[PDB]
């Protein structure tokens, strides 16, 4: 029988019991590691049979990639060394 | 040391400020990019640790290379040139669709986003186990499995010249938080007449010194030695509901079994708590039925009175008494009946405010 | 007859107690396992009914065997030995990921879990239709299709020696429940000034003798001859909202069309109920517009006054009158306006309790 | 025109109508049938070309399977014949 | 001109009435069907624009034809006849399962349903980019991408003789709505003692002339030049919460940081608002800590007092003052503390109605 | 500094600021285009090797298709030309 905050006796009179307790663990992030998603596959052993499909893929990707690239550049242009003050 | 230009940027959340500084600190150097760009150009694997002595390893992942290497190249001298391009063309569009889903406009602020490793599954070729193994995760125990799946990534560079995305990952480790116990609550129904009620309490609550808190189990998984959460799970609880859990039965609300209900008994502390008005309870040792006093709502069954009880057809041996004999309903203060459906809450609240706006105009007349 | 050792186990829900007994009753015998282990070793199909005379048929499913048999083995004398192993290696990891998702730690209590046949889809090779056909389901009518998809499985044995999972299934059959009618409700907006309101009622409610209940349609699918639910769908409704549905207009709450709204008319009992202040209503038979008395909120259009009406551009012939002529707004008691967004509910409740805690201190002064 | 509990006339005055009723059918489970998920595929016609991949798969599976096996054994050890009383 | 037979049909929503008329207007003519039936019979592509001069183009999509054409037919003279049929047989069952999921009984009213182009993805062969390209969408800018993904389809014919489904699509175009501004709100915590609160407001609200409305961002995506929504996003807001946003601090509710909380500062209008009781604030220019008056709850940091501030370790240059110096807590009327978890709302409401039903019986005695 | 309905000053005293506004654009549907899902694939170059599988597929489809076809026919039989009045 554990005890504490929660009043097991009076709760049991209205049909409530505790059926398990556990400690509480949260996740912390530390360190770093770089992962690069290489969007252009190596196709040389396919001897240009996929040129049209690759070019269209590359064109579709630009529409998605350019706005993110712009946002990243927009931020770091506001990140200066200390002594500009 | 770097400084954020706050007047220029004008407005930013703490999350955006902190990710921006982290972006400056974690992005690859201008010439690490040209080196990375050249290393990517010459590789031909689905997954590859790019090791340049001096700099740290960079893990490169190509989402359709396994398909090219395993399915298309061995077919090079059996299939036509259109067909090879058509086969790959279907794969590339399916891959583009996933990039669009993940990095496209539905990604609200890409700069400060933290993308789970699982959300990257398709972008990384449809599976993450070999990626994790290269990072040092074996899959050998369930805690390490849970930690690995808590990895989150931030975007640090998008290259429109060679089409690649650099992400920075961090490794989760487990932080047991000192005072906090998560408790799982469970109710059984009780009878007033032929009406079956049960008291409405949350599925999980947390105790934290003197405080009782609500607990959102959405982001948690319940290992045998602790609850592991990827998110803050703790949230405030109203004083009224805390008083309910502290023993004030009048403070706990209750609702009907309007439908079917499978909780008319429970095994607890080696005893049976049972609504023996709603199911057949029977002492197996003696063969005699256990009737529930009609002015009682539950029965607390222990070995002082029945060492082995049969309950809705299930036979259970019980231990010595750990819950007192049921008291009369008139010695129990029940709290309000409520309904939890959200439209009922709004309808009853709307009525209550209207009566309460009324009440201030009579309390002008009498004062 | 078996008995559960309740003192040893100490704590258990009715669901866990009942699944444990069912586990004892449904698990294969110790020597049925060695026989099963040997039958599995020698088979080579994706799906296979394992028939041992005396014992019942056991359906064995292998999640990657179709891929091996159809894609890898015919390639045995055209592809290298690494490549065959690499091809399968990708499939095995994708299969492991699904086993991890379903049977891993996110499965809260595996002993008492009931896993839908659809959740098993990937573990069973990506599709369940041939599995169901072997069990006797043809796919020939939609009720049989619905029943088959209500199959649930429990785990009865996990073999770490030969790596297989024995599950026990049960067959759903349909139970029409006696008194209970599900009703679908639908509102049209009405005008007070230029403001468009509608009364807030649930999408579905259920009648059950004298009682009106709430109805959760999440687990139901609406066949022409009845609502089929995989879960309890019935839940309590507050007395106040029940009074609303029983004719007390003052008890029903109401909310604005703050946005766009496509319900300004409805066809009901062969009549048109229309907010003819908010759209153009016109009698097609006579060519004359139908204006809505500005002190009325709706128009009830029948063939006593217009056999064929044009309504927001749609032309409808209507039948004889089944709803009385609209009454003046002053002869209708409207209930409270409310907002249903959950943060508004909390903000208005928080205010109401504070005023109500106030009110008890003036009612000490005046008494 | 159906009638009963719900008061269609007075609701129609505030724009609410019923647009369909149905009976209520719930599912019951009965009987039993065993289904076995065979986790190890038959690979003999692949002549050991997949040994490394199979062994790693089998190793990954144990981590998931062992805790469930333990839970099942933990329960049935508390399920005894009647007469132990 | 056509008329709907309202007496026969008896009951129908505006959505069902309007889709039915649209069904009559958009369905292919009886002889366009026999022509379509014959054109389908002779084609062999996955996607194909069926052009019959006079009639408009009809886009025909075959969900497994790419698999047949790319994978099975080139194998015709290397694999056995069973194996080809087994390979396709797996694909056909997977395709049937998706048709069953989309057009089967879970589709509540197929006649008036509007099916998003994305929901059709699998029925159309696993990807929609080539289908959209044939319809004129290039993928060249993100607005055109968003518009294309807002296409919805209605069913206009189901052929049981030749097994095909005719759908009618419509093209979305963008409607900027005149007066409506969407605003994103963000809070920082403040301290009363060691307790961290924050005021509870919605993540998005909308202003619309004099009105403030709630805003459901579920169906929206936030482009740089506007919020694009596929659904009505506007909904009513209670007068009480509108007063909160209009400057009545006593009307805004508040809740605890019971857990972890990452919003103790924010950059706004070139200034820093910071809970400098809960984190270290420091002037970098002068090197001097910034303490928060213990009878104040926030600090408003500008260049009149600190041109460059360090805040929880992050260094930010700020601009000239745009927010007044913090006032004493006693000059700020705080609103009610509340908890938002839905079961707390119901428990406190249930108590409030019970006290309020009490209150009417004492106000009979004293009057 | 924008101004209007929402009172930024008094909200800032209780920790609330606005971090972005945008205009509101909703989608409208116009015009029409027919799309046909061809459920029976062209299999002639497979020389009857798939007859059993195709026939079973076609049989499974009927159960799903027939109720929709019936619903569509039920509606258009209530859609008449104007002059029947
Ligand atoms: C457990 O049970 C009862 C509640 O039913 C509590 O006794 C009440 O105590 C209050 C004052 O604290 C009295 O005014 C009431 O008259 C009592 N109720 C009844 C029905 O007699 C008891 O104190 C509870 N224990 C706790 C910790 O709250
Ligand atoms: C249907 O309509 C009205 C509600 O608007 C009901 O008439 C009211 O009856 C109550 C007593 O039951 C009277 O005190 C009110 O004065 C009436 N209201 C008005 C505006 O006159 C009528 O009884 C309702 N029918 C039902 C079953 O509730
Ligand atoms: C902004 O701040 C305060 C609220 O704290 C408002 O001043 C109050 O005004 C009301 C009447 O409108 C007075 O009864 C109160 O005495 C004032 N409160 C205090 C603490 O002095 C001020 O008007 C608010 N501005 C707006 C637009 O609401
Ligand atoms: C692709 O593969 C070959 C072999 O690994 C590599 O040397 C070559 O540089 C790559 N192709 C391209 C275009 O870089
Ligand atoms: C796999 O297949 C063959 C043929 O069915 C069977 O006889 C053999 O026993 C199986 N292989 C193994 C290792 O059991
Ligand atoms: C399938 O393909 C061929 C070539 O396109 C076509 O001519 C033929 O009519 C189609 N087959 C059938 C059965 O219609």
Swiss-Prot record, chains A, D, F:
Superkingdom in the source lineage: Viruses
Residues the record marks as carrying a glycan: 10, 42
Annotated consequence of substituting residue 75 to V: Hyperfusogenic
Residue numbers spanned by region HRC: 50-76
Name assigned to this protein: Fusion glycoprotein F2
Residues of the full protein shown: 20 to 104 of 550
Swiss-Prot record, chains B, C, E:
Region: Fusion peptide, residue numbers: 1-24
Effect of residue 211 to S: Greatly reduced fusion function. No effect on F0 processing
Effect on the protein of changing residue 235 to A: Greatly reduced fusion function. No effect on F0 processing
Phenotype upon changing residue 351 to K: Hyperfusogenic
Stretches the record annotates as HRB: 331-367
Effect the entry attributes to changing residue 340 to W: Hyperfusogenic
Variant or mutagenesis effect after changing residue 323 to A: Greatly reduced fusion function. Inefficient F0 processing
Reported impact of residue 148 to R: Hyperfusogenic
Disulfide bonds: 220-229, 244-252, 276-281, 283-306
Annotated phenotype, changing residue 347 to W: Hyperfusogenic
Protein name from the UniProt record: Fusion glycoprotein F1
Gene responsible for this protein: F
Coverage span on the entire protein: 115 to 481 of 550
């Amino acid at each position: 029988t554990p005890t504490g905050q929660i009043h097991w006796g009076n709760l049991s009179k209205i049909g409530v019991v505790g059926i398990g307790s556990a400690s509480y663990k949260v996740m912390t992030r530390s360190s770093h590691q770089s992962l690069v998603i290489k969007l252009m596959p190596n196709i040389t052993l396919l001897n240009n049979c996929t040129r049209v499909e690759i070019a269209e893929y590359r064109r579709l990707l630009r529409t998605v990639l350019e706005p993110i690239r712009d946002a990243l550049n927009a931020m770091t242009q506001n990140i200066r060394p200390v002594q500009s003050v | 040391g770097v400084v954020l230009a706050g007047a220029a940027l004008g407005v930013a959340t703490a999350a955006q400020i902190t990710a921006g500084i982290a972006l400056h600190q974690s992005m690859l150097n201008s010439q690490a990019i040209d080196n990375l760009r050249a290393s990517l150009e010459t590789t031909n694997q689905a997954i590859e640790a790019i090791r340049q002595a001096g700099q740290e390893m960079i893990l490169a992942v190509q989402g359709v290379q396994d398909y090219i290497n395993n399915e298309l190249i061995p077919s090079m001298n059996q299939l036509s040139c259109d067909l090879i391009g058509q086969k790959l063309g279907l794969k590339l569009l399916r891959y583009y669709t996933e990039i669009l889903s993940l990095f496209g406009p539905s990604l609200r602020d890409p700069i400060s986003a933290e993308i789970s490793i699982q959300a990257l599954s398709y972008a990384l070729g449809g599976d993450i186990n070999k990626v994790l193994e290269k990072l040092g995760y074996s899959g050998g125990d369930l805690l390490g499995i849970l930690e690995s799946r808590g990895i989150k990534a931030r975007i640090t560079h998008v290259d429109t010249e060679s089409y690649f995305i650099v992400l920075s990952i961090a490794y989760p480790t487990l932080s047991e938080i000192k005072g906090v116990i998560v408790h799982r609550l469970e109710g059984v129904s009780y009878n007033i007449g032929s009406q079956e009620w049960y008291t409405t309490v949350p599925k999980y609550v947390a105790t934290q010194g003197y405080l009782i808190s609500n607990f959102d189990e959405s982001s948690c998984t319940f290992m045998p030695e602790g609850t592991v959460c990827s998110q803050n799970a703790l949230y405030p609880m109203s004083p009224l509901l805390q008083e309910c859990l502290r023993g004030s039965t009048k403070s706990c609300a209750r609702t009907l079994v309007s439908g079917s209900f499978g909780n008319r008994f429970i095994l607890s502390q080696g005893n049976l708590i049972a609504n023996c008005a709603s199911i057949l309870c029977k002492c197996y040792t003696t063969g005699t039925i256990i009737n529930q006093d009609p002015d009682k709502i539950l029965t607390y069954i222990a070995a002082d009175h029945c060492p082995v009880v049969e309950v809705n057809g299930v036979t259970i041996q019980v231990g010595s008494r750990r819950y007192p004999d049921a008291v009369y309903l008139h010695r129990i203060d029940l709290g309000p009946p409520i309904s939890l459906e959200r439209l009922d809450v709004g309808t009853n609240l709307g009525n209550a405010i209207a009566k309460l706006e009324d009440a201030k105009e009579l309390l002008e007349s009498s004062d």
